[PDB]
Design a protein around this ligand. Structure first.
Ligand SMILES: CCCCCCCCOCCOCCOCCOCCO
Ligand SMILES: CCCCCCCCCCCC[N+](C)(C)[O-]
Ligand SMILES: CCCCCCCCCCCC[N+](C)(C)[O-]
Ligand SMILES: [Cu+2]
Ligand SMILES: [Cu+2]
Ligand SMILES: [Cu+2]
Length: 427
């Protein structure tokens, strides 16, 4: 799922986010589907977070003989979520919410040998949503939302053992026996692993919109179609490189050097438009079944290019992602008044062409496996607890002069609190 994430609710967590867009047992889903707004009677609030704990590890050996082994490169994260749905009439209502649909955090030591392609990579995303729905009739409704997305991002790359790989290569060339070759090799050989080869940081606002269409046979079965617009963030950040300005222009793959001087960079980040189709099915007073299928057009994400105020390129990297799907299936079991249980299973193909993979975005196909509970205090307040396990297939990665093998699992824990308000008098 690239650097996308769909942890907007702890209840969603317990059911491997299946159905989401057809279930309305809590306000969290209006963030997923605007049409669901017309499924609430009174003001509803929801808020909580998901603690994500990844276990991604890298392995390999550089041509320099140095270890490309990198343990625990994906740090833990806390993804909060807040939701509020407010019916106005039996025909209109509005909802706001703060969730996060995109994020990533990979970090290697700055002395890592594959540093040139594995330093630090951060992308924080907070999505502010405000939207309304319309119950055209008893059969189905329509939603539509406005999105203000704030993103913080930071990219840092270092010289791994490139300096050595270069020097080593220069030593094997005829240029080797030369006083200039040796000199050159010495210079290359001299670049420390932690020499910052690229620095990009910046916060920028982005906007977009989403919509949804709910359809229900009765009040126990429904199906939906939602759309999340692509979102473009043109960052106005700071760029830098610690390599001597001399490296510049020869036309090497090296980012622009600035002698450590901070330049002004511009880069456009393209968050993929999203499309999902889901269904919820109550099949007993105590059993319901949910499922879905999402489609992200990851192809809108082709590359990251940092530019100067004069249009010159400081940094650039080809991503070449492709569209992919996510499939989910879960069941909720309403025990009694106070208790409710759930479980889910899912699978999402990777948007990253097994040949365009990077260690910076350790991504592979993922298989979810979740379970969760909801404890109702009194029809007005409840708490949700979710847990999920994401294991996957190990992959091989050929980036730069390196060959790695990446593997990764993840544990997810989440808690949410929900509260309803009295149903307001309306005609
Ligand atoms: C997408 C860019 C990331 C690639 C990192 C480029 C880092 C460049 O090198 C820093 C070391 O000094 C110069 C090396 O020569 C350029 C490429 O490496 C060639 C391998 O023999
Ligand atoms: C100042 C601009 C900062 C923008 C950095 C955006 C990072 C988005 C995360 C994608 C990770 C891809 N990678 C390897 C290029 O970092
Ligand atoms: C600031 C948000 C940080 C969120 C980073 C989320 C990392 C989730 C880890 C799953 C990556 C593993 N993989 C390859 C199996 O997909
Ligand atoms: Cu009412
Ligand atoms: Cu009232
Ligand atoms: Cu009245």
């Amino acid at each position: 799922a690239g650097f996308q994430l769909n942890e907007f609710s702890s209840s969603g967590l317990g059911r491997a986010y299946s159905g989401e867009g057809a279930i309305a047992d809590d306000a969290g889903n209006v963030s997923r589907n605007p049409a669901l707004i017309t499924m609430f009677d009174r003001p509803t609030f929801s808020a909580g977070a998901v603690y994500i704990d990844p276990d991604v590890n890298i392995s390999g050996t550089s041509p320099s003989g140095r270890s490309l082994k990198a343990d625990n490169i994906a740090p833990t994260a806390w993804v909060p979520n807040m939701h509020f749905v407010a019916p106005i009439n039996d025909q209109f209502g509005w909802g706001a919410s703060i969730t996060s649909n995109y994020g990533l955090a990979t970090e290697f030591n700055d002395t890592y040998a594959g540093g040139s392609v594995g330093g630090t990579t951060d992308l924080e995303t907070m999505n502010l949503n405000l939207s309304g729905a319309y119950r055209l009739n008893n059969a189905w409704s329509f939603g539509l939302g406005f999105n203000a997305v704030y993103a913080r991002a930071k990219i840092e790359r270092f010289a791994g053992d490139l300096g050595q790989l270069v020097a080593g290569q220069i030593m094997q060339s005829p240029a080797g026996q030369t006083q200039q070759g040796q000199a050159l090799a010495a210079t290359a050989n001299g670049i420390d692993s932690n020499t910052k080869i690229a620095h990009l940081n910046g916060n920028q606002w982005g906007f977009g919109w989403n919509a949804g269409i709910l359809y229900e046979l009765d009040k126990n079965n429904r199906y939906a179609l939602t759309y999340r617009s692509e979102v473009k963030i043109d960052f106005k950040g700071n760029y830098s490189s610690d390599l001597n300005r001399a490296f510049n222009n020869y036309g090497l793959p090296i980012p622009t050097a600035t002698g450590g001087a901070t330049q002004s960079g511009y880069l456009t980040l393209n968050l993929p438009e999203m499309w999902e189709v889901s269904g919820y099915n109550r099949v007993d007073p105590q059993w319901a079944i949910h499922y879905s299928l999402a489609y992200t057009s990851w192809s809108q994400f082709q590359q990251l290019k940092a530019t100067s105020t004069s249009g010159d390129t400081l940094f650039q990297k080809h991503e070449g992602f492709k569209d992919a799907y996510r499939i989910a299936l879960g069941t909720t079991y309403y025990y009694d008044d106070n208790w409710t249980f759930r479980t889910g299973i899912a699978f999402d193909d990777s948007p990253v062409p097994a040949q365009n993979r990077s260690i910076s975005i350790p991504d592979q196909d993922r298989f979810w496996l979740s379970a969760g509970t909801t404890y109702a205090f009194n029809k007005d307040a409840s708490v949700d607890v979710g847990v999920s396990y994401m294991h996957g297939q190990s992959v091989k990665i050929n980036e730069g002069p390196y060959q790695f093998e990446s593997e990764g699992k993840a544990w997810l824990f989440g808690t949410n609190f929900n509260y309803a308000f009295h149903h307001h008098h309306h005609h």
